[PDB]
Design an enzyme around this catalytic site. Structure first.
Site, PDB file in Angstrom:
ATOM      1  N   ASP A  70      31.291  24.176 -23.167  1.00  0.00           N
ATOM      2  CA  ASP A  70      31.560  22.793 -23.505  1.00  0.00           C
ATOM      3  C   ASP A  70      31.247  21.949 -22.266  1.00  0.00           C
ATOM      4  O   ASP A  70      30.993  22.473 -21.181  1.00  0.00           O
ATOM      5  CB  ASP A  70      33.025  22.571 -23.968  1.00  0.00           C
ATOM      6  CG  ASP A  70      33.263  22.889 -25.431  1.00  0.00           C
ATOM      7  OD1 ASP A  70      32.370  23.366 -26.172  1.00  0.00           O
ATOM      8  OD2 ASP A  70      34.414  22.604 -25.866  1.00  0.00           O
ATOM      9  N   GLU A  71      31.290  20.608 -22.392  1.00  0.00           N
ATOM     10  CA  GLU A  71      30.873  19.633 -21.392  1.00  0.00           C
ATOM     11  C   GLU A  71      31.529  19.796 -20.022  1.00  0.00           C
ATOM     12  O   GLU A  71      30.858  19.754 -18.992  1.00  0.00           O
ATOM     13  CB  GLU A  71      31.130  18.181 -21.908  1.00  0.00           C
ATOM     14  CG  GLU A  71      32.607  17.743 -22.134  1.00  0.00           C
ATOM     15  CD  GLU A  71      33.366  18.628 -23.107  1.00  0.00           C
ATOM     16  OE1 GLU A  71      34.308  19.356 -22.702  1.00  0.00           O
ATOM     17  OE2 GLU A  71      33.003  18.642 -24.312  1.00  0.00           O
ATOM     18  N   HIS A  79      23.616  19.850 -29.726  1.00  0.00           N
ATOM     19  CA  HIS A  79      25.004  19.638 -30.149  1.00  0.00           C
ATOM     20  C   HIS A  79      25.137  18.421 -31.081  1.00  0.00           C
ATOM     21  O   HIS A  79      24.326  17.501 -31.035  1.00  0.00           O
ATOM     22  CB  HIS A  79      25.962  19.473 -28.937  1.00  0.00           C
ATOM     23  CG  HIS A  79      27.434  19.574 -29.254  1.00  0.00           C
ATOM     24  ND1 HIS A  79      27.858  20.276 -30.373  1.00  0.00           N
ATOM     25  CD2 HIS A  79      28.507  19.084 -28.577  1.00  0.00           C
ATOM     26  CE1 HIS A  79      29.177  20.199 -30.348  1.00  0.00           C
ATOM     27  NE2 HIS A  79      29.620  19.495 -29.280  1.00  0.00           N
ATOM     28  N   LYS A  94      37.547  18.609 -35.226  1.00  0.00           N
ATOM     29  CA  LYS A  94      36.626  17.541 -34.869  1.00  0.00           C
ATOM     30  C   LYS A  94      35.498  17.167 -35.841  1.00  0.00           C
ATOM     31  O   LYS A  94      35.177  15.986 -35.970  1.00  0.00           O
ATOM     32  CB  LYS A  94      36.068  17.742 -33.434  1.00  0.00           C
ATOM     33  CG  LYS A  94      35.438  19.119 -33.168  1.00  0.00           C
ATOM     34  CD  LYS A  94      34.637  19.162 -31.852  1.00  0.00           C
ATOM     35  CE  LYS A  94      35.442  18.952 -30.556  1.00  0.00           C
ATOM     36  NZ  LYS A  94      36.333  20.087 -30.269  1.00  0.00           N
ATOM     37  N   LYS A 132      29.273  30.065 -25.924  1.00  0.00           N
ATOM     38  CA  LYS A 132      28.784  28.732 -25.587  1.00  0.00           C
ATOM     39  C   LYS A 132      29.780  27.937 -24.766  1.00  0.00           C
ATOM     40  O   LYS A 132      30.997  28.048 -24.925  1.00  0.00           O
ATOM     41  CB  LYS A 132      28.360  27.925 -26.846  1.00  0.00           C
ATOM     42  CG  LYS A 132      29.448  27.558 -27.881  1.00  0.00           C
ATOM     43  CD  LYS A 132      30.205  26.229 -27.648  1.00  0.00           C
ATOM     44  CE  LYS A 132      29.301  24.995 -27.540  1.00  0.00           C
ATOM     45  NZ  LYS A 132      30.088  23.752 -27.477  1.00  0.00           N
ATOM     46  N   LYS A 173      36.768  28.048 -23.903  1.00  0.00           N
ATOM     47  CA  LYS A 173      37.862  27.120 -23.746  1.00  0.00           C
ATOM     48  C   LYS A 173      38.919  27.857 -22.936  1.00  0.00           C
ATOM     49  O   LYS A 173      38.936  29.088 -23.005  1.00  0.00           O
ATOM     50  CB  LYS A 173      38.436  26.697 -25.134  1.00  0.00           C
ATOM     51  CG  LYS A 173      39.053  27.823 -25.991  1.00  0.00           C
ATOM     52  CD  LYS A 173      40.590  27.944 -25.912  1.00  0.00           C
ATOM     53  CE  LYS A 173      41.055  29.384 -26.175  1.00  0.00           C
ATOM     54  NZ  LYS A 173      42.489  29.476 -26.499  1.00  0.00           N
TER      55      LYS A 173
END
Lengths: 469, 132, 469, 132, 156
Positions: A197-198, A288, A328, A195, A169
């Site tokens: 993210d989109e 995911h 989330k 990892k 992030k």
């Protein structure tokens, strides 16, 4: 009737045609358990029977032409139903289907018949799926995990403590050389796996292809200069299946270790085809999990965590994301632990105290590995380790990229906290009370952990116990 | 009851399953169709050219691929542009009917907003085969 | 900041970093409108800003490393929000995103960013998507309908009245010669189109491959022996994408006109890839829709009909499914007419009375055709025709397969009623009151309709007005 | 104005959209074409073989692929090499007409510079269908 | 020297050329083979000829009926004449439009076959044709003001 019935015009009551409360199940029968509230004036056996009739046969006026098909043992059956002990109009329906009704291992046919047709009805106020009985011959014509937990343990070349990581992030738009620097430093500092993210994968100027080349350059040295096995979960997101296949095949050329996909947020058959491809090319596949307020949290009116864990594993994956604790996804003890058991393990009979109404026969079904992400660090490591042990795949969101000394001391502090917790766990300590003093003891000269514990001195949350959907 | 089947004749598309519309019903419905803002065209087709075919599949390698044959109708001289008078249409229908004994004559119209053509009433020839 | 910010450790207030109640839109901005209720103790601007922050950048502890990415005009922004009149703790949030943040037409990246990450949060009680602003350059990198309404009108070779059909039932297990007989007789009797259901496509003994060959023998003669252009919607369903592609390619060989798929009950990217394939091979593509209780009917807590219609058309389809009136899908006036308008038409500005909060700029976006089904027949034909005109694609489920004289008089009665209603519409009749007398007038010698109207004398239902979720 | 459609007969290619040229006009135009350095040939074709066909496409795997059928003409004994007399051509047309009542007879010629054959006037049979 | 079987070529008026000292050289260099250089034709170099495929001019053809004589007299049985006024300019529709153009083509070709002085005879041939083709009579009332031939000199 076995066929040739001369029915009179109209509809014969579903309770006189699709309701059998003494039904003796076969080993090959497919069963579904649903929690329901009818619209006012509808009997619940009329509702249950109508659901069984519409998912099996269907009618909107029956005459002799419905006599053309063989009905007999081949049609769905509604068994005896029971009330829910929490609400007056809520009932649990139990519906059985024989083997002959569906295409063998056909996920869109099973999905459309069981969920698609069923979760529609205007005279049904709310309907929630509570469990499913999948017979072994449909479990085995399904494909399941490509390289599950007992395969990944020997395949990844390391194990003996949890797998340490971090979630990359900001989502927005990080340039490739600053991303390359961040990835190299946090992997070299102590993380096992990072990892994406989109938005991280591909952006208007930056192609996934070139982001992948900066990953290749970084990853070679992020094993080679550190001696220890590490890597990075790529996330591979895309708009069309041709683009998805192009994304697969270009990384097949370099045969990279473990990747992940939001493919199973895209669609069920996308993951099923990928899992077959992953099995074929000897890969590892991370899945995911998302959409928690509109899928997972559908209180009395849709999907729940135990059925979600069964549905996710009956497509398959080697890793699958778990809980975020806060933010989330959930973090609740009466939600996560059943959900994780249904992913991890094999050979266990049904129990109503765990909300399990049906058993699917077991003995040779691969396990799939929970990935915990991980919004709070240092003080919540004791409780996390005590609850989950050497499950996870702990991917931090606060750790590493929240340390004001940079990615290497951030990763080193998270690595020191994992090794200090793992040494405490090896010492047989009472983690809930001892873990704070272990962290204080650890801080003396790791300076990195001393900085981590000054920076995160406000977070003391463990977990909530009871569901909060 | 009930024995159903077109005997000595077939179903020539929309409005063939019901009793055939009269010249008075056609003129009244043309005035209505004009009132609703549709633009008429008079069209005709030969007896074997108004009934669906696929024989032409013999000439082309990729088939059936959305292709169809013997459903094309030829326009009668002019479309009804400017003038919309039902008596001009009636004179053209009579002249068309007189011109071709072995062709069917039909009215079609279009909606100019997205330019879509509607194929309406009625398939008629002075040698129309058996009524249902 | 455009990058290079030394942020102090800890999360900065979202209302000071992602909330802009004076924002004026760019032509390339992507906007989303959401209906929300926070958990008790969270401000609605804090909630809106947090949604914008988590869908843009996300944080669980901000430090100088979040300064590495360019923020400036490249981040999501929460605009001014308004109260909901229906409930005190409900608010409508308006969130803007720039084009810099998302891959061009990337459906899983856009879906995961806007819906996937967002619709989860533990401190969010309920969140419902109300509208979306898709800028023209993202509308055109979406592919839209393959063969939409202005193409489909000329492709089907007939038009000027609705398209008459029927849904084939029982769903279970009908053998090939009785299926062949029923399909041939109802198509030769008067139907334009027949339809399969998911179980009808493939069964443990009966393969789709052989069901298709019995369709081929029947369909050749069900045009050739009738004279009028007709077909059959094949329903195509499959367990994996390889099976979907095999099903596609084998029916490309015979190049049949219109087919349907529940591929878009499987997943969005499956339909997007197929729609490109269908466009490439010059086909016609019907889209199925299911799960109405757990998708479409998500009250204050998820998906709604207008956003569903926008999302479905921004993947694409030529036909699209759509209310059953009674039973499984909708039948309501204040639900269907908006939903159909958002599918049929192009170039129309936003109106709050139609629940539209955002205009996606228009001019060259194909229409897509609603397919209703249609459980009630003869007496509800007047009201259906008067409400919907020459929209639909009306697929009966009582009509045809509920007539005790067989499939040909059933189909003939439905065809007689369609032509009688269309003739009444051509006569300028007050169809809601005249249609009953038109049906009685037809019944004198249509004996087939006389039997249809003695058989269905009980049904007199029109439509309900107000939305029922 | 204006009804347009060939009835009881079709347009047999070039010079069929004009009235039939007389035997004297055909001989005069042959004398001119000979004067201009063209070499005549008299040719004939069977009634179904003078009208274009695509049925033979059934035998071959790649179709339409520029292939055509029933547009081939058979030669009347000799080409006009050496002697060029138009009255010999007229005698041959009469002999051809007597020999084949059910075949069409036409004149063709070629320009030997780049060896190109011209298909001229007129498709004619003593059972020739309706005049326009 | 890339190649084509047909190739485009004067519109007569509008977008492309219509001139004698432009078209006739251009057409000769497409049709023909085995011909040596001449400075009066602007040829400075001969590429060796013998087995070089010909290529067919396509004109398009804005003016119809009265300019058919002049076109046929200048170009013969080159073209591939794609009309722009003909057919889609006839107020009786596409079949009488096409029929008028076809009648004029066959009437001009019959005049050419009779060895007529086409530039002066062609107007009377068109009048003679109009007695019973009504379609051509309508074509000659509709296009009554255009009597143009070609200009000679290149107007670049």
């Amino acid at each position: 009737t076995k066929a040739g019935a001369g029915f009179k015009a109209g509809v014969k009551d579903y309770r006189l045609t699709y309701y059998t409360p003494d039904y003796v199940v076969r080993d090959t029968d497919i069963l579904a358990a649903f929690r329901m509230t009818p619209q006012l004036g509808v009997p619940p056996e009329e509702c249950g029977a109508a659901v069984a009739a519409e998912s099996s046969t269907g009618t909107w006026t029956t005459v002799w032409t419905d006599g053309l098909t063989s009905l007999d043992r081949y049609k769905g059956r509604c068994y005896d139903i029971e009330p829910v002990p929490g609400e007056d109009n809520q009932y649990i329906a139990y519906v059985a289907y024989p083997i002959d009704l569906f295409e063998e291992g056909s996920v869109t046919n099973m999905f459309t018949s069981i969920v698609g047709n069923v979760f529609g009805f205007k005279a049904l106020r709310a309907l929630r799926l509570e469990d499913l009985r999948i017979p072994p011959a449909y479990v085995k014509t399904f494909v399941g995990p490509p390289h599950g937990i007992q395969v990944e343990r020997d395949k990844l070349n390391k194990y003996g403590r949890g797998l340490l990581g971090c979630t990359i992030k900001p989502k927005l738009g990080l340039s490739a050389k600053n991303y390359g620097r961040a990835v190299y430093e946090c992997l070299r500092g102590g993380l096992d796996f990072t990892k994406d993210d989109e938005n991280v994968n591909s952006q208007p100027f930056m192609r996934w292809r070139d982001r992948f080349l900066f990953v290749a350059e970084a990853i070679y040295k992020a094993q080679a200069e550190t001696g220890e096995v590490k890597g990075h979960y790529l996330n591979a997101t895309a708009g069309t299946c041709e683009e998805m296949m192009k994304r697969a095949v270009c990384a097949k050329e370099l045969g990279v270790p473990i990747i992940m996909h939001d493919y199973l947020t895209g669609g069920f058959t996308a993951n099923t085809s990928l899992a077959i491809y992953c099995r074929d090319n000897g890969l590892l596949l991370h899945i995911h999990r998302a959409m928690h307020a509109v899928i997972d949290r559908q209180r009395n009116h849709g999907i729940h965590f135990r059925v979600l864990a069964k549905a996710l594993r009956m497509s398959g994956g080697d890793h699958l994301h778990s809980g975020t604790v806060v933010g989330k996804l959930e973090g609740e003890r009466e939600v996560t632990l059943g959900f994780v058991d249904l992913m991890r393990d094999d050979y266990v009979e049904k129990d109503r105290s765990r909300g399990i109404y049906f058993t699917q026969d077991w003995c040779s079904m691969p396990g799939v590995m929970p990935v915990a992400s991980g919004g709070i660090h240092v003080w919540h490591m004791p409780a996390l380790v005590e609850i989950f042990g050497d499950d996870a795949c702990l991917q931090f969101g606060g750790g590493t990229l929240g340390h004001p000394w940079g990615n290497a001391p951030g990763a080193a502090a998270n690595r020191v906290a994992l090794e200090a917790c793992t040494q405490a766990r090896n010492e047989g300590r009472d983690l809930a009370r001892e873990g704070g003093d272990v962290i204080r003891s650890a801080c003396k000269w790791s300076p990195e952990l001393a900085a981590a514990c000054e920076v995160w001195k406000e977070i003391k949350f463990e977990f909530d116990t009871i569901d909060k959907l | 009851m009930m024995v159903w089947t077109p005997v000595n004749n077939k179903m020539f598309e929309t409005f063939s399953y019901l009793p055939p519309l009269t010249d008075e019903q056609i003129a009244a419905q043309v005035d209505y169709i004009v009132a609703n803002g549709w633009i008429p065209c008079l069209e005709f087709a030969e007896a074997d050219k108004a009934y669906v075919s696929n024989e032409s599949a013999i000439r082309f390698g990729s088939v059936s691929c959305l292709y169809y044959d013997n459903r094309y109708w030829t326009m009668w001289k002019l479309p009804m542009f400017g003038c919309r008078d039902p008596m001009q249409v009636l004179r053209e229908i009579v002249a068309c009917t007189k011109a071709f004994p072995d062709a069917y004559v039909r009215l079609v119209a279009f909606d100019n907003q997205k330019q879509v053509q509607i194929m309406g009433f009625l398939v008629q020839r002075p040698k129309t085969a058996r009524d249902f």
